[PDB]
Amino acid sequence: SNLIEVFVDGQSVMVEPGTTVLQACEKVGMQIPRFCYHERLSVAGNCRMCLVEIEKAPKVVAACAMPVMKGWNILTNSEKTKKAREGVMEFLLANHPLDCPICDQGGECDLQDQSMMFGSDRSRFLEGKRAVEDKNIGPLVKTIMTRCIQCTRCIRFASEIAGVDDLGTTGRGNDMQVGTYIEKMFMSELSGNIIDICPVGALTSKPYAFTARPWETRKTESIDVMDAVGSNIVVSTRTGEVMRILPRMHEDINEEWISDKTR
Amino acid sequence: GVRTSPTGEKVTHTGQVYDDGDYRKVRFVGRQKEVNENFAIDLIAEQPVSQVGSRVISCDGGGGALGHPRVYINLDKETKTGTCGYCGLQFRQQHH
Amino acid sequence: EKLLNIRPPPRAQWIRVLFGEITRLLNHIMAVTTHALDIGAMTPFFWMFEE
Amino acid sequence: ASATRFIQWLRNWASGRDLQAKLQLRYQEISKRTQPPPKLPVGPSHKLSNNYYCTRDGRREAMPPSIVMSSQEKKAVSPAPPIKRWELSQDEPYL
Amino acid sequence: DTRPTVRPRNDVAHKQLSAFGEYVAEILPKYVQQVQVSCFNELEICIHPDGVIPVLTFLRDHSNAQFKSLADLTAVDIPTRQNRFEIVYNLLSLRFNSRIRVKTYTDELTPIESSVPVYKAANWYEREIWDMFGVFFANHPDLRRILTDYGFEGHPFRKDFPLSGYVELRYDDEVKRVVAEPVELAQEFRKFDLNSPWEAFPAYRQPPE
Amino acid sequence: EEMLTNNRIWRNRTVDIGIVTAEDALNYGFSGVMLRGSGIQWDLRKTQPYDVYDQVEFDVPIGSRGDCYDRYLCRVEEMRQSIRIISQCLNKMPPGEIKVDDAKVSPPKRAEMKTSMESLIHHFKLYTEGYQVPPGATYTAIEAPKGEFGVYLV
Amino acid sequence: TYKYVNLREPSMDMKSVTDRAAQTLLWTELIRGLGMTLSYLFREPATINYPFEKGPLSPRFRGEHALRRYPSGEERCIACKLCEAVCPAQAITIEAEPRADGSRRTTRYDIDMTKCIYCGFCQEACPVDAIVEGPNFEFSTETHEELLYNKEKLLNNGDKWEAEIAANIQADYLYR
Amino acid sequence: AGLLKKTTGLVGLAVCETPHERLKILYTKILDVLGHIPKNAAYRKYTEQITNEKLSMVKAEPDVKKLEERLQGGQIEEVILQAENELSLARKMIQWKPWEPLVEEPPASQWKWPI
Amino acid sequence: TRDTQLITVDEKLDITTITGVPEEHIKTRKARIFVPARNNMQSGVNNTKKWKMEFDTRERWENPLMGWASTADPLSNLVLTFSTKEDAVAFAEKNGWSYDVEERKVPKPKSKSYGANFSWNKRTRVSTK
Amino acid sequence: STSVKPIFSRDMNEAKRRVRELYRAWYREVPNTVHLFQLDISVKQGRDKVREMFKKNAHITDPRVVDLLVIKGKMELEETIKVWKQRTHVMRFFHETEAPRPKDFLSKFYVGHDP
Ligand code: SF4
Ligand code: SF4
Ligand code: SF4
Ligand code: SF4
Ligand code: FES
Ligand SMILES: [K+]
Ligand SMILES: [Zn+2]
């Protein structure tokens, strides 16, 4: 066939042309770190957390946006790859606020877990952090944008999945802020999903605010009945009480999204 | 402060009070219901709003390592005060 | 620590040996004096349990 | 420590040792209950440079067991050299 | 090897134990199924359960083994396997100042040969395995429950046994006796999901699917 | 010892009582003073040392008759050897930190957890999820005050 | 290195044999034991006059729990639930919601003082020093229900023992 | 041989008055049992190797104290006791025949960890 | 070969009578064999690699004293991990439980091109970056 | 696939010999159990309880499962004979302090959600 051969840490794998370095590592069970890449949105390549060394190449490549060339040996655990993940994680946490105890994302946060799996264990940052002013985008999504890492997943989702071009980046540089610029409400039938695709606690559920923590919930896999689509959901419960509703991936029904009524 | 429902049972700071028909009130017969009278919501509101001449101010809660993690608060918004998410202290920008 | 593949720092190792041997005196005082108490001798229990 | 010299002699004589030198009751020789604040040192990883975690990561240097034999001329060997014989204490060989 | 926070690696012992592992396998090919040495220099001999007595007797009596002390005997319950149980022997050699692990397996219904003839220490350890796991040991002097209550039903250390059991005790005044009734908890044990969804150790990754 | 060691009443209750032979002690899984009371020269603090026990000097008491009396002498003598070790620990105590300088295993100082983003993440995760231990099984044993105390951790 | 504890041979010279004969007949070594206990009779007893004299403790003592406040009077707890997650005995139960002013605060904070093992992990895990184990060790009760503390009991403990808790922390926070 | 030790130091282990004679008997007896083991069995080759090495030292060290150091097996009575344990094992190894191929391979994932 | 003098037993493995479990918890239960779904709040996929066996949820009520969540179900916290679906089904049938099996859901491979973000004549051109 | 090591019995005929032997041992021991433990039940009640316990496991057809039941049952008899059990343990077979749970659908429907 047209399949080309690439190596992931020396293991051969046959991938279709156009496949990305990140997708080639999935074929062998390896998951590359990521904050901006989502398998159902456009490729951004702006978090630089997926940098992976390619053998016999002096430069690291964005694994989420780099197509695989034939005969490449992707080194997912070399010193260069691991030193690229520590630097990027160090830059993500430089201005991030010490909000973990009061942040609803604590315990199920990709920034926490990838900081403890791919980053360093301390900080050499001896300055003052940045502070951003919060924004109101409706009664459903609570915004604390000091925690935003400018991953643009909410921008791509709102424009592509929801077909609403209301979110964007204003300013430039370290002062780049995600928002609607003007006082506007991102009220859409798929508006609640920006909570999930936000890796940090910048976007969180307002009804669910402060009620529970991820580890103490019990997950019941059920079906949504608010409409005839039959969206698959997870009913999170704690001590005999329903706490929140979450999407459950089903490729042929609802992807990994659910409408606001369901959520 | 501490309120009292019509039955005379003191309402806690969490809004808890047994209804008239609730049998669980019997546990207080011959004893007392322990209610803390120093409502935090009331006390924190008594603190004055501090004026600071900068866009961004930081709060560690007072005492350094005896306080809370140091967070940074934005004061650009002129229609409200900036509030610390740990201790509740409020800050404002000097004449903007 | 063997499974983690880490090593405790030298000062911690000495404290653990220090209190490991203070803990040995706690055990042997209990063992010897309660052994004597069962056999009948009762006063050594009181002298060494103040230590 | 308040015992009279007569009783001190009597208790010393009966036990056969100078008890007053090693009293089992503590007096002002103990440390003060209030002590000055400490300033604890930092570990060897409290550096600002040449301190990447991939160079000091113990957990990531653990490997799965090395399989010697699997079912999927030579000299006899013991698990280790025979244990060396112990030597009698030079401090107090016989109690 | 100068790194303060990383455990030093002893490669001399790793070599010696690997050589003795082959030594055992060459002498007992009839039972030895697998041999391995961990990164912390511990040797494991995996055997067919029919070789419990031959393998242990060799290690106890052989001149170059002299494993004359049974440090411990225990079982591990892994429900995913056909032989869910895994009988583990830890032996200590005072002559050669070394330790070895012998591992076998059995299911709920297959007996395992008793080790009492080799090690008298195994008398009480095998009662514990039967008591807490339900593994029967053949030719045991007196096989009984050793840790659970009299008339206790079930083997607690099985993974499918609930943490709080099925019965609880209280004193009933009507019958002037201590009675057993189905378990009810004023506060249920809260189950936490703590596993991170991000792989921690690439070196131990399994082949896909 | 003035009350027990040379007391004839005490010696009657202990001498030639509970004799265990050296070969039976090993085959029954005995350890510690039970082995040493029968003359077996074995102490894990000297043969398989851990921590810093190879940097301290002490003697291992050894019995000769394997009876309750000899094992009593070993315990009284070990208490003297523990004072010997403590004297060396009090003098050779070094400076430095007291937990491994690896915040992915041991929590950071509270002053660091309230100042550094990385430390707060690690304090949060260590006290909620804990640190992951790589797969494997180990049998670790020490010379506990009353024998070989071991853990088979999987 | 090792040493024999009971490997000795008694000298068989006539004087030594007679010395042992006197010991056997005249009970010499049994009178040393009498002398040893006689000396203790004249030593000052080590007994303290409780409850008027209390055994010494240290600032690190782990006693009765208390929920602390800031100098402003605001509660320190922000319902992070780290103490609930690390509690070895699962003795802590927490529920929280947005307060009327928007703050993150608990509507429930229960410690079952009969499940608690008084280990101090909860105060090691708290990021804001909200939950502490105080120096009180005299709180025995006449009923099992009085040891099931709720947020109201724990706040009163904080308002009760703050003058002492704050001083003990001051004397120990540089070791934490 | 020199002076005869008064005690072995191990409870229940009597002092042997003819150690060199007793060790020749046992080591020789071991080599006789190993003959009935198949010539290519690893137990026969290894046990014969070590047994001859021990037997060689016994026949070249008339002094007991010096012989203990060369054998490195503790007191001479411990070495005699271990020669008797090697003889019982050799007799039992004949009835077990562990040199035969593996009785049965385990299920495919019987020794996989983690589950 | 073996010399243990084996015997032939031809019948489905069943240990319900020797496990010690009460009758009411072998016949009225329903064990759900499934691969846990990804926690949508994260991107990691390491929790969706092993099969699990959880039982049906029973009643939880409110403790009249402290309001805690009380239960009378001994198997409310019982989760078993299996390497394969057939391993899970074998364990369920061995212990007599009734089981429902949910087939694994794997994300489908997707064609991701960064060059499609800037397309000459397609709707995949992005208005923002 | 079907070859397995037996515990004691090679077939059901051999396993049922042990079951009947165990029933005799229990049948003869009830009169003493009601006597030594001073149970307030009669021999008829106790011997009917033994019969009930045996009948619960009458549908078994696996000789290995039957052997475990006899082995477990023999251990129960040993504790009763030697008075390792107390009056509480013997009387735990009768559930005297448990209110009889409903069996029909309507009764279970009213009182709760369990099947
Ligand atoms: S987004 Fe994650 S790292 Fe940032 S404060 Fe929230 S939980 Fe902590
Ligand atoms: S708000 Fe969340 S999803 Fe949007 S850019 Fe920031 S981190 Fe990404
Ligand atoms: S001291 Fe320990 S057991 Fe007690 S509440 Fe705190 S963490 Fe839980
Ligand atoms: S750890 Fe402290 S802040 Fe967090 S819930 Fe417990 S008491 Fe509150
Ligand atoms: S995941 Fe590739 S740069 Fe963000
Ligand atoms: K989010
Ligand atoms: Zn603050």
UniProtKB/Swiss-Prot annotation, chain A:
Transmembrane segments: none annotated. [2Fe-2S] cluster binds at residues 36, 47, 50, 64. The modification N6-acetyllysine is found at residue 56. GO terms for cellular component: mitochondrial inner membrane; mitochondrial intermembrane space; mitochondrion; respiratory chain complex I. Residues 80-119 form the 4Fe-4S His(Cys)3-ligated-type domain. GO terms for molecular function: 2 iron, 2 sulfur cluster binding; 4 iron, 4 sulfur cluster binding; metal ion binding; NADH dehydrogenase (ubiquinone) activity. Residues 2-80 form the 2Fe-2S ferredoxin-type domain. Residues 217-263 form the 4Fe-4S Mo/W bis-MGD-type domain. Keywords: 2Fe-2S, 4Fe-4S, Acetylation, Electron transport, Iron, Iron-sulfur, Membrane, Metal-binding, Mitochondrion, Mitochondrion inner membrane, NAD, Oxidoreductase, Respiratory chain, Transit peptide, Translocase, Transport, Ubiquinone. Belongs to the complex I 75 kDa subunit family. This is NADH-ubiquinone oxidoreductase 75 kDa subunit, mitochondrial. The lineage of its organism: Eukaryota, Metazoa, Chordata, Craniata, Vertebrata. The gene is NDUFS1. The chain holds residues 29 to 291 of 727 of the full protein.
Swiss-Prot record, chain B:
One of its GO terms (cellular component) is mitochondrion. It comes from the Eukaryota. The keyword Disulfide bond does not apply. Keywords: Electron transport, Membrane, Mitochondrion, Mitochondrion inner membrane, Respiratory chain, Transit peptide, Transport. Its main location: mitochondrion. The keyword Electron transport applies. It is found in: Mitochondrion inner membrane. GO terms for biological process: mitochondrial electron transport, NADH to ubiquinone. It is a peripheral membrane protein. Belongs to the complex I NDUFS6 subunit family. Accessory subunit of the mitochondrial membrane respiratory chain NADH dehydrogenase (Complex I), that is believed not to be involved in catalysis. Complex I functions in the transfer of electrons from NADH to the respiratory chain. The immediate electron acceptor for the enzyme is believed to be ubiquinone. Mammalian complex I is composed of 45 different subunits. This is a component of the iron-sulfur (IP) fragment of the enzyme. This is NADH dehydrogenase [ubiquinone] iron-sulfur protein 6, mitochondrial. It comes from Bos taurus. The gene is NDUFS6.
UniProtKB/Swiss-Prot annotation, chain E:
Its EC number is 7.1.1.2. It is a peripheral membrane protein. GO terms for biological process: mitochondrial electron transport, NADH to ubiquinone; mitochondrial respiratory chain complex I assembly; reactive oxygen species metabolic process. The keyword Iron-sulfur does not apply. GO terms for molecular function: NADH dehydrogenase (ubiquinone) activity; NADH dehydrogenase activity. Belongs to the complex I 30 kDa subunit family. This is NADH dehydrogenase [ubiquinone] iron-sulfur protein 3, mitochondrial. It comes from Bos taurus. The gene is NDUFS3.
Curated annotation (Swiss-Prot), chain G:
The lineage of its organism: Eukaryota, Metazoa, Chordata, Craniata, Vertebrata. It comes from the Eukaryota. It is found in: Mitochondrion inner membrane. Core subunit of the mitochondrial membrane respiratory chain NADH dehydrogenase (Complex I) which catalyzes electron transfer from NADH through the respiratory chain, using ubiquinone as an electron acceptor. Essential for the catalytic activity and assembly of complex I. It is a peripheral membrane protein. The chain holds residues 37 to 212 of 212 of the full protein. Core subunit of respiratory chain NADH dehydrogenase (Complex I) which is composed of 45 different subunits. This is a component of the iron-sulfur (IP) fragment of the enzyme. Interacts with RAB5IF. It comes from Bos taurus. Binds 2 [4Fe-4S] clusters per subunit. This is NADH dehydrogenase [ubiquinone] iron-sulfur protein 8, mitochondrial. Its EC number is 7.1.1.2. Its cofactor is [4Fe-4S] cluster. Its main location: mitochondrion. Belongs to the complex I 23 kDa subunit family. It is an enzyme of class 7 (translocase). [4Fe-4S] cluster 2 binds at residues 87, 116, 119, 122. [4Fe-4S] cluster 1 binds at residues 77, 80, 83, 126. Keywords: 4Fe-4S, Electron transport, Iron, Iron-sulfur, Membrane, Metal-binding, Mitochondrion, Mitochondrion inner membrane, NAD, Oxidoreductase, Repeat, Respiratory chain, Transit peptide, Translocase, Transport, Ubiquinone. One of its GO terms (cellular component) is mitochondrial inner membrane. Residues 68-97, 107-136 form the 4Fe-4S ferredoxin-type domain. GO terms for molecular function: 4 iron, 4 sulfur cluster binding; metal ion binding; NADH dehydrogenase (ubiquinone) activity. One of its GO terms (biological process) is mitochondrial respiratory chain complex I assembly.
